[PDB]
Every structure is written in structure tokens, then in C-alpha cells.
């Protein structure tokens, strides 16, 4: 799975965690087997304006 | 004249200013006829690690 979120909302990508992303955007199962790999993408996704 | 500095040192690139960049690195004359251009390069010059 792949998506883009802000830095404060990275922690909501976790099993048994709440937030805007967990409730409304992306919910992990409470018993989840896998890896959450998040890296900063200022150079690729930001632009002036 | 092209160089890379910090964000907080951008205000030191001006005629008649003080600081580390103005005293030790790049000094602008008081009788300056010209333009100062400064753009953010977090995308291209910065690197994680």
C-alpha cells in the first residue's frame, strides 16, 4: 500500500491507533503482520506556490 | 556571484550588514548597484543523513 501524508499524522499508521487517517482514510487491522515504511518526500512532492 | 547559505543568513546578504557571512564569507559594498536572488534548495542541496 502506498500513500502520502503529513509528518504529524505518520503515527496514526499503526495497529490499534486512532486519528483522522485511521478513522477516515486508512485503517490497519488490530493484528497486522507487515511493515510500515515512511520516508520524507520534500524533494519529490513539494513545489513552490 | 553564486553560493549556498543558511536561511537565517539570507538577510546578511545586503549592503551594510553584520554577521558571520558578511564579515568572514561575503561582504557587500555600501555603494551597491545590483540584485540579490535567493531561492530555497531543500529539494536539491539537502540530503537525509
JSON list of C-alpha atoms in Angstrom, two decimals:
[
{"chain": "A", "resi": 1, "resn": "UNK", "atom": "CA", "xyz": [0.00, 0.00, 0.00]},
{"chain": "A", "resi": 2, "resn": "UNK", "atom": "CA", "xyz": [1.26, 3.48, -0.84]},
{"chain": "A", "resi": 3, "resn": "UNK", "atom": "CA", "xyz": [0.11, 7.00, 0.05]},
{"chain": "A", "resi": 4, "resn": "UNK", "atom": "CA", "xyz": [1.32, 10.47, 1.08]},
{"chain": "A", "resi": 5, "resn": "UNK", "atom": "CA", "xyz": [0.53, 12.10, 4.46]},
{"chain": "A", "resi": 6, "resn": "UNK", "atom": "CA", "xyz": [1.90, 14.90, 6.59]},
{"chain": "A", "resi": 7, "resn": "UNK", "atom": "CA", "xyz": [4.52, 14.37, 9.27]},
{"chain": "A", "resi": 8, "resn": "UNK", "atom": "CA", "xyz": [2.28, 14.77, 12.31]},
{"chain": "A", "resi": 9, "resn": "UNK", "atom": "CA", "xyz": [-0.11, 12.08, 11.04]},
{"chain": "A", "resi": 10, "resn": "UNK", "atom": "CA", "xyz": [2.54, 9.40, 10.44]},
{"chain": "A", "resi": 11, "resn": "UNK", "atom": "CA", "xyz": [1.91, 7.89, 13.90]},
{"chain": "A", "resi": 12, "resn": "UNK", "atom": "CA", "xyz": [-1.72, 7.06, 13.03]},
{"chain": "A", "resi": 13, "resn": "UNK", "atom": "CA", "xyz": [-0.43, 4.35, 10.64]},
{"chain": "A", "resi": 14, "resn": "UNK", "atom": "CA", "xyz": [-0.30, 1.76, 13.42]},
{"chain": "A", "resi": 15, "resn": "UNK", "atom": "CA", "xyz": [-2.39, -1.20, 14.63]},
{"chain": "A", "resi": 16, "resn": "UNK", "atom": "CA", "xyz": [-4.90, -0.13, 17.27]},
{"chain": "A", "resi": 17, "resn": "UNK", "atom": "CA", "xyz": [-4.36, 3.60, 16.74]},
{"chain": "A", "resi": 18, "resn": "UNK", "atom": "CA", "xyz": [-6.88, 6.41, 16.25]},
{"chain": "A", "resi": 19, "resn": "UNK", "atom": "CA", "xyz": [-6.86, 9.64, 14.28]},
{"chain": "A", "resi": 20, "resn": "UNK", "atom": "CA", "xyz": [-8.16, 11.21, 11.10]},
{"chain": "A", "resi": 21, "resn": "UNK", "atom": "CA", "xyz": [-6.25, 8.81, 8.83]},
{"chain": "A", "resi": 22, "resn": "UNK", "atom": "CA", "xyz": [-7.26, 5.78, 10.92]},
{"chain": "A", "resi": 23, "resn": "UNK", "atom": "CA", "xyz": [-10.96, 6.63, 11.09]},
{"chain": "A", "resi": 24, "resn": "UNK", "atom": "CA", "xyz": [-11.49, 8.18, 7.66]},
{"chain": "A", "resi": 25, "resn": "UNK", "atom": "CA", "xyz": [-8.57, 7.38, 5.32]},
{"chain": "A", "resi": 26, "resn": "UNK", "atom": "CA", "xyz": [-6.52, 4.26, 6.14]},
{"chain": "A", "resi": 27, "resn": "UNK", "atom": "CA", "xyz": [-7.14, 1.78, 8.96]},
{"chain": "A", "resi": 28, "resn": "UNK", "atom": "CA", "xyz": [-4.79, -1.05, 9.83]},
{"chain": "A", "resi": 29, "resn": "UNK", "atom": "CA", "xyz": [-6.13, -4.21, 11.49]},
{"chain": "A", "resi": 30, "resn": "UNK", "atom": "CA", "xyz": [-5.53, -4.60, 15.22]},
{"chain": "A", "resi": 31, "resn": "UNK", "atom": "CA", "xyz": [-3.48, -7.75, 14.47]},
{"chain": "A", "resi": 32, "resn": "UNK", "atom": "CA", "xyz": [-1.44, -6.63, 11.47]},
{"chain": "A", "resi": 33, "resn": "UNK", "atom": "CA", "xyz": [1.53, -8.57, 10.07]},
{"chain": "A", "resi": 34, "resn": "UNK", "atom": "CA", "xyz": [3.80, -6.37, 7.98]},
{"chain": "A", "resi": 35, "resn": "UNK", "atom": "CA", "xyz": [5.91, -3.24, 7.83]},
{"chain": "A", "resi": 36, "resn": "UNK", "atom": "CA", "xyz": [5.12, 0.48, 7.75]},
{"chain": "A", "resi": 37, "resn": "UNK", "atom": "CA", "xyz": [7.93, 2.21, 5.84]},
{"chain": "A", "resi": 38, "resn": "UNK", "atom": "CA", "xyz": [7.66, 6.00, 5.87]},
{"chain": "A", "resi": 39, "resn": "UNK", "atom": "CA", "xyz": [10.24, 8.41, 4.45]},
{"chain": "A", "resi": 40, "resn": "UNK", "atom": "CA", "xyz": [10.35, 12.16, 4.00]},
{"chain": "A", "resi": 41, "resn": "UNK", "atom": "CA", "xyz": [9.50, 13.26, 0.46]},
{"chain": "A", "resi": 42, "resn": "UNK", "atom": "CA", "xyz": [10.05, 17.01, 0.48]},
{"chain": "A", "resi": 43, "resn": "UNK", "atom": "CA", "xyz": [12.12, 16.88, -2.71]},
{"chain": "A", "resi": 44, "resn": "UNK", "atom": "CA", "xyz": [9.55, 14.89, -4.71]},
{"chain": "A", "resi": 45, "resn": "UNK", "atom": "CA", "xyz": [6.16, 16.13, -3.52]},
{"chain": "A", "resi": 46, "resn": "UNK", "atom": "CA", "xyz": [6.66, 19.79, -2.59]},
{"chain": "A", "resi": 47, "resn": "UNK", "atom": "CA", "xyz": [6.74, 22.69, -5.03]},
{"chain": "A", "resi": 48, "resn": "UNK", "atom": "CA", "xyz": [6.77, 26.47, -4.86]},
{"chain": "A", "resi": 49, "resn": "UNK", "atom": "CA", "xyz": [3.32, 28.00, -4.69]},
{"chain": "B", "resi": 1, "resn": "UNK", "atom": "CA", "xyz": [28.16, 35.55, -7.56]},
{"chain": "B", "resi": 2, "resn": "UNK", "atom": "CA", "xyz": [26.70, 32.15, -6.69]},
{"chain": "B", "resi": 3, "resn": "UNK", "atom": "CA", "xyz": [26.84, 30.39, -3.32]},
{"chain": "B", "resi": 4, "resn": "UNK", "atom": "CA", "xyz": [24.76, 28.32, -0.88]},
{"chain": "B", "resi": 5, "resn": "UNK", "atom": "CA", "xyz": [23.97, 29.56, 2.64]},
{"chain": "B", "resi": 6, "resn": "UNK", "atom": "CA", "xyz": [21.55, 29.01, 5.52]},
{"chain": "B", "resi": 7, "resn": "UNK", "atom": "CA", "xyz": [18.07, 30.51, 5.62]},
{"chain": "B", "resi": 8, "resn": "UNK", "atom": "CA", "xyz": [18.80, 32.74, 8.62]},
{"chain": "B", "resi": 9, "resn": "UNK", "atom": "CA", "xyz": [21.90, 34.06, 6.81]},
{"chain": "B", "resi": 10, "resn": "UNK", "atom": "CA", "xyz": [19.91, 35.25, 3.76]},
{"chain": "B", "resi": 11, "resn": "UNK", "atom": "CA", "xyz": [19.31, 38.61, 5.47]},
{"chain": "B", "resi": 12, "resn": "UNK", "atom": "CA", "xyz": [23.08, 39.02, 5.83]},
{"chain": "B", "resi": 13, "resn": "UNK", "atom": "CA", "xyz": [23.35, 39.33, 2.02]},
{"chain": "B", "resi": 14, "resn": "UNK", "atom": "CA", "xyz": [22.55, 43.05, 1.93]},
{"chain": "B", "resi": 15, "resn": "UNK", "atom": "CA", "xyz": [24.56, 46.29, 1.67]},
{"chain": "B", "resi": 16, "resn": "UNK", "atom": "CA", "xyz": [25.77, 47.33, 5.11]},
{"chain": "B", "resi": 17, "resn": "UNK", "atom": "CA", "xyz": [25.12, 44.29, 7.30]},
{"chain": "B", "resi": 18, "resn": "UNK", "atom": "CA", "xyz": [26.90, 42.40, 10.07]},
{"chain": "B", "resi": 19, "resn": "UNK", "atom": "CA", "xyz": [27.21, 38.71, 10.85]},
{"chain": "B", "resi": 20, "resn": "UNK", "atom": "CA", "xyz": [29.40, 35.72, 10.12]},
{"chain": "B", "resi": 21, "resn": "UNK", "atom": "CA", "xyz": [28.65, 35.69, 6.38]},
{"chain": "B", "resi": 22, "resn": "UNK", "atom": "CA", "xyz": [29.06, 39.45, 5.99]},
{"chain": "B", "resi": 23, "resn": "UNK", "atom": "CA", "xyz": [32.34, 39.65, 7.90]},
{"chain": "B", "resi": 24, "resn": "UNK", "atom": "CA", "xyz": [34.03, 36.35, 7.02]},
{"chain": "B", "resi": 25, "resn": "UNK", "atom": "CA", "xyz": [32.43, 34.95, 3.84]},
{"chain": "B", "resi": 26, "resn": "UNK", "atom": "CA", "xyz": [30.73, 37.50, 1.57]},
{"chain": "B", "resi": 27, "resn": "UNK", "atom": "CA", "xyz": [30.78, 41.28, 2.10]},
{"chain": "B", "resi": 28, "resn": "UNK", "atom": "CA", "xyz": [28.58, 43.58, 0.02]},
{"chain": "B", "resi": 29, "resn": "UNK", "atom": "CA", "xyz": [29.69, 47.18, -0.59]},
{"chain": "B", "resi": 30, "resn": "UNK", "atom": "CA", "xyz": [27.58, 50.12, 0.53]},
{"chain": "B", "resi": 31, "resn": "UNK", "atom": "CA", "xyz": [27.60, 51.59, -3.00]},
{"chain": "B", "resi": 32, "resn": "UNK", "atom": "CA", "xyz": [25.90, 48.51, -4.42]},
{"chain": "B", "resi": 33, "resn": "UNK", "atom": "CA", "xyz": [24.03, 48.64, -7.73]},
{"chain": "B", "resi": 34, "resn": "UNK", "atom": "CA", "xyz": [22.62, 45.16, -8.24]},
{"chain": "B", "resi": 35, "resn": "UNK", "atom": "CA", "xyz": [20.15, 42.48, -7.28]},
{"chain": "B", "resi": 36, "resn": "UNK", "atom": "CA", "xyz": [20.18, 39.70, -4.68]},
{"chain": "B", "resi": 37, "resn": "UNK", "atom": "CA", "xyz": [18.36, 36.49, -5.63]},
{"chain": "B", "resi": 38, "resn": "UNK", "atom": "CA", "xyz": [17.82, 33.75, -3.06]},
{"chain": "B", "resi": 39, "resn": "UNK", "atom": "CA", "xyz": [15.73, 30.62, -3.55]},
{"chain": "B", "resi": 40, "resn": "UNK", "atom": "CA", "xyz": [15.17, 27.60, -1.33]},
{"chain": "B", "resi": 41, "resn": "UNK", "atom": "CA", "xyz": [17.01, 24.45, -2.40]},
{"chain": "B", "resi": 42, "resn": "UNK", "atom": "CA", "xyz": [15.87, 21.96, 0.22]},
{"chain": "B", "resi": 43, "resn": "UNK", "atom": "CA", "xyz": [14.97, 19.63, -2.67]},
{"chain": "B", "resi": 44, "resn": "UNK", "atom": "CA", "xyz": [18.31, 19.61, -4.49]},
{"chain": "B", "resi": 45, "resn": "UNK", "atom": "CA", "xyz": [21.05, 20.52, -1.99]},
{"chain": "B", "resi": 46, "resn": "UNK", "atom": "CA", "xyz": [19.84, 18.90, 1.24]},
{"chain": "B", "resi": 47, "resn": "UNK", "atom": "CA", "xyz": [20.06, 15.19, 1.96]},
{"chain": "B", "resi": 48, "resn": "UNK", "atom": "CA", "xyz": [18.85, 12.95, 4.78]},
{"chain": "B", "resi": 49, "resn": "UNK", "atom": "CA", "xyz": [21.78, 11.82, 6.89]}
]
